[PDB]
Motif scaffolding. Structure first.
Motif, PDB file in Angstrom:
ATOM      1  N   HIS A  72       0.926  -1.345  -0.044  1.00 11.75           N
ATOM      2  CA  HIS A  72       0.017   0.037  -0.011  1.00 11.75           C
ATOM      3  C   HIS A  72       0.768   1.152  -0.113  1.00 11.75           C
ATOM      4  N   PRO A  73       1.310   1.760  -1.320  1.00  9.27           N
ATOM      5  CA  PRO A  73       2.044   2.881  -1.300  1.00  9.27           C
ATOM      6  C   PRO A  73       1.318   4.130  -0.858  1.00  9.27           C
ATOM      7  N   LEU A  74       1.774   5.133  -0.013  1.00  4.79           N
ATOM      8  CA  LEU A  74       1.088   6.501   0.006  1.00  4.79           C
ATOM      9  C   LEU A  74       1.890   7.318  -0.447  1.00  4.79           C
ATOM     10  N   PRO A  75       1.185   8.613  -0.984  1.00  2.00           N
ATOM     11  CA  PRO A  75       2.180   9.947  -1.444  1.00  2.00           C
ATOM     12  C   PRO A  75       2.407  10.504  -0.179  1.00  2.00           C
ATOM     13  N   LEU A  76       3.520  11.232  -0.301  1.00  3.77           N
ATOM     14  CA  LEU A  76       4.022  12.088   0.818  1.00  3.77           C
ATOM     15  C   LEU A  76       3.216  13.463   0.883  1.00  3.77           C
ATOM     16  N   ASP A  77       3.289  13.911   2.202  1.00  2.64           N
ATOM     17  CA  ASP A  77       2.889  15.401   2.310  1.00  2.64           C
ATOM     18  C   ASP A  77       1.299  15.212   2.051  1.00  2.64           C
ATOM     19  N   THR A  78       0.647  14.192   2.225  1.00  2.00           N
ATOM     20  CA  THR A  78      -0.726  14.129   1.980  1.00  2.00           C
ATOM     21  C   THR A  78      -1.568  13.357   3.009  1.00  2.00           C
ATOM     22  N   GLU A  79      -2.613  13.811   3.635  1.00  2.00           N
ATOM     23  CA  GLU A  79      -3.349  13.451   4.668  1.00  2.00           C
ATOM     24  C   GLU A  79      -4.216  12.016   4.113  1.00  2.00           C
ATOM     25  N   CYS A  80      -3.695  10.916   4.485  1.00  2.00           N
ATOM     26  CA  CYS A  80      -4.543   9.525   4.132  1.00  2.00           C
ATOM     27  C   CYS A  80      -5.132   9.047   5.217  1.00  2.00           C
ATOM     28  N   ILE A  81      -6.090   8.275   5.357  1.00  2.55           N
ATOM     29  CA  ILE A  81      -6.974   7.590   6.109  1.00  2.55           C
ATOM     30  C   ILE A  81      -6.671   6.020   6.065  1.00  2.55           C
ATOM     31  N   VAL A  82      -5.832   5.337   7.213  1.00  2.00           N
ATOM     32  CA  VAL A  82      -5.610   4.144   7.030  1.00  2.00           C
ATOM     33  C   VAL A  82      -6.199   3.530   8.444  1.00  2.00           C
ATOM     34  N   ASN A  83      -7.139   2.461   8.074  1.00  2.00           N
ATOM     35  CA  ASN A  83      -7.886   1.592   9.051  1.00  2.00           C
ATOM     36  C   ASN A  83      -8.484   2.881  10.173  1.00  2.00           C
ATOM     37  N   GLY A  84      -9.061   3.765   9.611  1.00  4.23           N
ATOM     38  CA  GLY A  84      -9.500   4.652  10.464  1.00  4.23           C
ATOM     39  C   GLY A  84      -9.054   5.604  10.938  1.00  4.23           C
ATOM     40  N   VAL A  85      -7.685   6.084  10.926  1.00  2.00           N
ATOM     41  CA  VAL A  85      -6.939   6.843  11.319  1.00  2.00           C
ATOM     42  C   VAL A  85      -6.080   7.755  10.444  1.00  2.00           C
ATOM     43  N   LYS A  86      -5.823   9.001  10.501  1.00  2.00           N
ATOM     44  CA  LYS A  86      -5.397   9.935   9.666  1.00  2.00           C
ATOM     45  C   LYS A  86      -3.833   9.788  10.015  1.00  2.00           C
ATOM     46  N   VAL A  87      -3.062   9.476   8.790  1.00  2.00           N
ATOM     47  CA  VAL A  87      -1.846   9.487   8.714  1.00  2.00           C
ATOM     48  C   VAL A  87      -1.132  10.277   7.708  1.00  2.00           C
ATOM     49  N   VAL A  88       0.110  10.613   7.733  1.00  2.00           N
ATOM     50  CA  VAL A  88       0.779  11.493   6.839  1.00  2.00           C
ATOM     51  C   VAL A  88       2.080  10.920   6.782  1.00  2.00           C
ATOM     52  N   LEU A  89       2.809  10.789   5.416  1.00  3.02           N
ATOM     53  CA  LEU A  89       4.373  10.479   5.394  1.00  3.02           C
ATOM     54  C   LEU A  89       4.885  11.878   4.847  1.00  3.02           C
ATOM     55  N   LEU A  90       6.024  11.800   5.604  1.00  7.56           N
ATOM     56  CA  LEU A  90       6.835  12.983   5.269  1.00  7.56           C
ATOM     57  C   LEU A  90       8.372  12.481   4.906  1.00  7.56           C
ATOM     58  N   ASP A  91       8.833  13.298   4.004  1.00  7.19           N
ATOM     59  CA  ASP A  91      10.372  13.166   3.763  1.00  7.19           C
ATOM     60  C   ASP A  91      11.318  12.785   4.827  1.00  7.19           C
ATOM     61  N   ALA A  92      11.936  11.871   5.237  1.00  7.28           N
ATOM     62  CA  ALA A  92      12.875  11.755   6.446  1.00  7.28           C
ATOM     63  C   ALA A  92      14.324  12.285   6.140  1.00  7.28           C
ATOM     64  N   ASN A  93      14.725  12.583   4.859  1.00  8.78           N
ATOM     65  CA  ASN A  93      16.099  13.263   4.413  1.00  8.78           C
ATOM     66  C   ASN A  93      17.094  11.899   4.851  1.00  8.78           C
ATOM     67  N   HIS A  94      16.454  10.865   4.628  1.00  2.16           N
ATOM     68  CA  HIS A  94      17.382   9.530   4.974  1.00  2.16           C
ATOM     69  C   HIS A  94      18.134   8.954   3.421  1.00  2.16           C
ATOM     70  N   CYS A  95      17.507   7.882   3.109  1.00  2.00           N
ATOM     71  CA  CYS A  95      17.808   7.163   1.913  1.00  2.00           C
ATOM     72  C   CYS A  95      16.600   7.436   1.162  1.00  2.00           C
ATOM     73  N   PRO A  96      16.689   6.882  -0.152  1.00  2.00           N
ATOM     74  CA  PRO A  96      15.449   7.127  -1.086  1.00  2.00           C
ATOM     75  C   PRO A  96      14.343   6.380  -0.602  1.00  2.00           C
ATOM     76  N   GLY A  97      13.030   6.920  -0.693  1.00  2.00           N
ATOM     77  CA  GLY A  97      12.044   6.326  -0.156  1.00  2.00           C
ATOM     78  C   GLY A  97      11.712   6.475   1.332  1.00  2.00           C
ATOM     79  N   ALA A  98      12.806   6.938   2.113  1.00  2.00           N
ATOM     80  CA  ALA A  98      12.528   7.046   3.692  1.00  2.00           C
ATOM     81  C   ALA A  98      11.514   7.963   3.974  1.00  2.00           C
ATOM     82  N   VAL A  99      10.825   7.485   5.029  1.00  2.00           N
ATOM     83  CA  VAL A  99       9.687   8.681   5.598  1.00  2.00           C
ATOM     84  C   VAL A  99       9.829   8.520   6.973  1.00  2.00           C
TER      85      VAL A  99
END
Ligand code: U2C
Ligand code: U2C
Ligand code: ZN
Ligand code: ZN
Length: 339
Positions: A72-99
């Protein structure tokens, strides 16, 4: 048994918890990034929903062969609902794809899980801004003041200048960069760019890089080794024996190897401009402190800005001394900043 710092209380969520079999009550498994200490356990046989970035999802599908129906990929910087809970992924400035993951719990609690990150002031202008965070699950890898290293830009500047000078002085020199996991791609990409070369690598590493959504990647990398003057090798081959062996391969096309080992922090005292290599004959090996984790000062500044009510470290949690040391610093940061 899953440790408590990998569970998100009030939810059925775990973070980076794949080596504990079926976790009781877990309805969604989050994976912050594709590093082996975090995805350990995932395989083609995993049958639970995995939430992650697009890039992490590409790697799960192509490298671990996880079935598409469970990714289940999610876009960054976007309010998403997962199992009834609002989640956001943010860039972690780690490796590619890290959040990093923001969880907005139903009771009003807000949790930030940094995954692995290199804290940066640019994060103070994401969805995190003016967002009260009650709990911070913090990457504390380098949570001690002796952990200082330069910016990534300074390290790349040194690498580019060093390689360009060596190849300009000796057009028959070969540059070798060590790698294992994803991350730190800028080291070899920036060197190849200044040398007008593509980066030659194995089929397996080429496949990995094709998953990272790097713009214009086909113009930058190749599996045609001897057509490139920047080669990637497994990190364990970056030694005099392994580099002597590699120099035979190219059929006497190169007479010198300059190799880069992009380590984390080391005890080396010295400034970035004064780094010197290990040399044996026509082979020189540079250890460069390219970190994808926060320095102490970067971590401190981020936490003092965020002002979390409680901090749960996710690294260095195994000894009483390490846990006590980190808690003393957290208290010092809190008293200095006033939260
Ligand atoms: C490259 C691997 C992975 C790895 N392992 C460890 N220690 C834990 C360990 C050792 C053996 C099994 O588990 N620490 C690392 C620190 C930085 C990086 Cl990049 C990789 C690390 C390695 O060094 N040994 O397998
Ligand atoms: C790429 C790294 C891999 C890694 N790093 C660490 N420490 C952080 C560290 C030390 C030197 C460089 O980076 N410890 C690990 C322990 C076990 C394994 Cl298998 C991998 C480890 C990462 O960022 N992983 O998330
Ligand atoms: Zn990592
Ligand atoms: Zn890690």
């Amino acid at each position: 048994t899953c440790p408590f710092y990998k569970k998100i209380p009030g939810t059925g969520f775990t973070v980076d918890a794949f080596q504990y079999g079926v976790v009781e009550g877990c309805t969604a498994y989050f994976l912050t990034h594709f590093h082996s200490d975090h995805y350990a356990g995932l395989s083609k046989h995993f049958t639970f929903p995995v939430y992650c970035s697009e890039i992490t999802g590409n790697l799960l599908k192509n490298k671990l062969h996880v079935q598409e129906q469970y990714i289940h990929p999610l876009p960054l910087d976007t309010e998403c609902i997962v199992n009834g809970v609002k989640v956001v992924l943010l860039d972690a400035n780690h490796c590619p794809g890290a959040v990093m993951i923001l969880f907005y719990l139903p009771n009003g609690t807000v949790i930030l899980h940094t995954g692995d990150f290199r804290a940066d002031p640019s994060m103070e202008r994401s969805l995190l801004a003016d967002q009260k965070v009650h709990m911070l699950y913090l990457d504390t890898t380098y949570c001690s003041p002796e952990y200082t290293f330069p910016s990534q830009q300074e390290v790349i500047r040194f690498a580019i200048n060093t390689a360009f000078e060596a190849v300009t002085l000796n057009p028959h020199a070969l540059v070798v960069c060590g790698t294992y996991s994803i991350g730190k791609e800028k080291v070899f990409l920036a060197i190849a760019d200044v040398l007008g070369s593509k980066v030659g690598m194995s089929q397996e590493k080429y496949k990995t890089l094709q998953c990272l959504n790097i713009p214009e990647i086909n113009s930058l990398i190749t599996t045609d080794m001897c057509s490139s003057l920047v080669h990637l090798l497994p990190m364990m081959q970056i030694n005099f024996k392994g580099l002597q062996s590699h120099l035979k391969k190219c059929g006497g096309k190169y007479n010198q190897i300059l190799a880069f080992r992009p380590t984390g922090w080391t005890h080396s005292f010295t400034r970035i401009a004064d780094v010197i290599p290990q040399t044996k004959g026509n082979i020189s090996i540079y250890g460069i402190p390219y970190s994808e984790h926060s320095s102490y000062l970067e971590m401190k500044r981020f936490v003092q800005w965020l002002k979390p009510q409680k901090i749960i470290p996710t690294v260095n949690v195994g000894t009483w001394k390490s846990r006590s040391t980190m808690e003393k610093y957290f208290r010092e940061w809190k008293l200095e900043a006033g939260y």
